[PDB]
Amino acid sequence: IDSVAVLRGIQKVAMLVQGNWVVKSDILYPKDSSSPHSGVPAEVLCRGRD
Amino acid sequence: PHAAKDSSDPNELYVNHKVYTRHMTWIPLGNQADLFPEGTIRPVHDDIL
Amino acid sequence: MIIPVRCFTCGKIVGNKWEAYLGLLQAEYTEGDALDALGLKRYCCRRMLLAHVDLIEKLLNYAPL
Numbered sequence: 001i002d003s004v005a006v007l008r009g010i011q012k013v014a015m016l017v018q019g020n021w022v023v024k025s026d027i028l029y030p031k032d033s034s035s036p037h038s039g040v041p042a043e044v045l046c047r048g049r050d
Numbered sequence: 051p052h053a054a055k056d057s058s059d060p061n062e063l064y065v066n067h068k069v070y071t072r073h074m075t076w077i078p079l080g081n082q083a084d085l086f087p088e089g090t091i092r093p094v095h096d097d098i099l
Numbered sequence: 100m101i102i103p104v105r106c107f108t109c110g111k112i113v114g115n116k117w118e119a120y121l122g123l124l125q126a127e128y129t130e131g132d133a134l135d136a137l138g139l140k141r142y143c144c145r146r147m148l149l150a151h152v153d154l155i156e157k158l159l160n161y162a163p164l
């Protein structure tokens with residue numbers, strides 16, 4: 001698999017932190033999901049993870 | 051009445067949610083108010099949950 | 100369910116040192132150094148605070164409210 005395609009694919013679902021790639025917050029927490037421990041909406045979880 | 055939109059921590063959402071022993075109020079009987087000055091009759095640690 | 104006020108063996112007041120202990124868990128302190136800083140020399144209070152499970156919030160999650 002070409003490196004450019006993998007890079008373009010990972011740029012849409014991940015962010016660069018200290019040279020490494022961390023998955024985006026909205027990917028782990030969909031809009032209809034909630035915190036399994038507190039039940040807060042997924043938007044707050046995404047803001048906290050960001 | 052005034053809290054954040056999320057307020058995940060119970061401290062911001064609710065008030066008096068943890069009943070500490072400091073809420074105990076000594077009620078004088080008869081002349082105990084005159085014999086005992088204010089602040090003497092009270093819980094020892096004042097922080098027991 | 101909830102942290103007991105008195106220690107079973109000795110009887111030292113331990114209910115008031117629970118939430119602060121949780122603060123020491125919210126901080127970078129480990130278990131042993133936090134129990135030492137709280138003033139628990141004998142191991143009975145250390146067992147009381149360490150082996151205690153906080154089930155009151157799990158029950159309040161099922162409370163009527």
Ligand SMILES: [Zn+2]
Nearest residue numbers: 106109143144
């Ligand atoms: Zn003890």
